[PDB]
Write an enzyme that holds these catalytic residues in place. Sequence first.
Site, PDB file in Angstrom:
ATOM      1  N   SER A  46       5.844  10.158  -6.467  1.00 59.08           N
ATOM      2  CA  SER A  46       4.754  10.480  -5.540  1.00 59.08           C
ATOM      3  C   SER A  46       5.124  10.286  -4.069  1.00 59.08           C
ATOM      4  CB  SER A  46       3.507   9.669  -5.922  1.00 59.08           C
ATOM      5  OG  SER A  46       3.240   9.843  -7.325  1.00 59.08           O
ATOM      6  N   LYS A  49       5.198  13.512  -1.910  1.00 55.00           N
ATOM      7  CA  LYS A  49       3.964  13.995  -1.283  1.00 55.00           C
ATOM      8  C   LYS A  49       4.092  14.136   0.250  1.00 55.00           C
ATOM      9  CE  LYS A  49       0.357  12.977  -4.708  1.00 55.00           C
ATOM     10  NZ  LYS A  49       1.253  12.562  -5.766  1.00 55.00           N
ATOM     11  N   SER A  93      -3.087   9.245  -3.895  1.00 56.68           N
ATOM     12  CA  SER A  93      -1.925   9.772  -4.621  1.00 56.68           C
ATOM     13  C   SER A  93      -2.336  10.770  -5.704  1.00 56.68           C
ATOM     14  CB  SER A  93      -1.092   8.642  -5.217  1.00 56.68           C
ATOM     15  OG  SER A  93       0.186   9.133  -5.601  1.00 56.68           O
ATOM     16  N   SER A 184       3.293   4.850  -1.954  1.00 61.80           N
ATOM     17  CA  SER A 184       3.867   4.279  -3.160  1.00 61.80           C
ATOM     18  C   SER A 184       4.321   5.384  -4.121  1.00 61.80           C
ATOM     19  CB  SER A 184       2.845   3.370  -3.842  1.00 61.80           C
ATOM     20  OG  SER A 184       1.813   4.145  -4.421  1.00 61.80           O
ATOM     21  N   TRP A 186       5.663   5.953  -8.485  1.00 61.90           N
ATOM     22  CA  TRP A 186       6.055   5.471  -9.810  1.00 61.90           C
ATOM     23  C   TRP A 186       6.431   6.678 -10.661  1.00 61.90           C
ATOM     24  CZ3 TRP A 186       2.899   1.261 -12.946  1.00 61.90           C
ATOM     25  CH2 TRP A 186       3.625   0.917 -14.089  1.00 61.90           C
ATOM     26  N   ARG A 226       4.338  -3.501  -6.180  1.00 64.30           N
ATOM     27  CA  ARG A 226       5.169  -2.790  -5.213  1.00 64.30           C
ATOM     28  C   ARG A 226       4.709  -3.077  -3.785  1.00 64.30           C
ATOM     29  NH1 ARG A 226       3.930   2.671  -7.566  1.00 64.30           N
ATOM     30  NH2 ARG A 226       2.259   1.302  -8.335  1.00 64.30           N
TER      31      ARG A 226
END
EC number: 3.5.2.6
Length: 243
Positions: A46, A49, A93, A184, A186, A226
């Site tokens: 992500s 983005k 996200s 962030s 994942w 994170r």
Amino acid sequence: SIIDQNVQALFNEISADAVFVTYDGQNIKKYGTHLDRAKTAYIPASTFKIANALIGLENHKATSTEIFKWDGKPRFFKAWDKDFTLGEAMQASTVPVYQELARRIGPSLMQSELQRIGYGNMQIGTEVDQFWLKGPLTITPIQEVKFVYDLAQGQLPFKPEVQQQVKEMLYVERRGENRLYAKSGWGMAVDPQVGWYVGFVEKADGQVVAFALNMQMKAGDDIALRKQLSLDVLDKLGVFHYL
Ligand SMILES: *C(=O)[C@H]([C@@H](C)O)[C@@]1(C)CC(S[C@@H]2CN[C@H](C(=O)N(C)C)C2)=C(C(=O)O)N1
């Protein structure tokens, strides 16, 4: 120095391979339990983005004001079952919104744009709305850090107002004069799974410190680890002190 020991002792409790890179425009600095991760390429997940919003705004495929409407099909999170601007979907996200954006760009323009700016290995494969989540696109922490550094400075190969708009989509919080921007990631669909927390700290002085946490993730991990680890590190470095 003692601040290096303080930062390294933060990772000395984490049972996961991790690296944290910083970039002040001159020096790359690496910390954590496996420094070689800084030069290893992982899928952006992500964090892509950022480039996706830049490419879409630059190429008249969306505006930062346009509303990406929910199509009524239940998304993974109940929180995603609504309308979003690109800014709002960036903070949440919201993957389906940015997949819609990628499909508007299309594979030909996505490919040529990633080659033009030199983002990671610039490989998208054949699914224009899946490449950052399953590969083949990969990027190093060092590459993420220099990318978002240039974004903060307005020095990416994009229109200045496009960079400004995407920059503030990333805005997390300010502490006195200092501003934190972050995204962030994942990547669960790959093996190993990869966790990202990338962004930068802008001082009112104008100095910027870019950073990228990159760490191995396992199914079931604390989703908040994170960001809390990155903010721990930034405070121990004295880049973004706890208030
Ligand atoms: C993108 O990197 C990633 C998917 C596509 O692999 C994505 C969108 C899922 C998650 S996990 C979940 C979504 N947001 C939650 C969160 O961070 N909080 C604090 C509520 C967890 C992420 C992610 O990076 O967290 N991104």
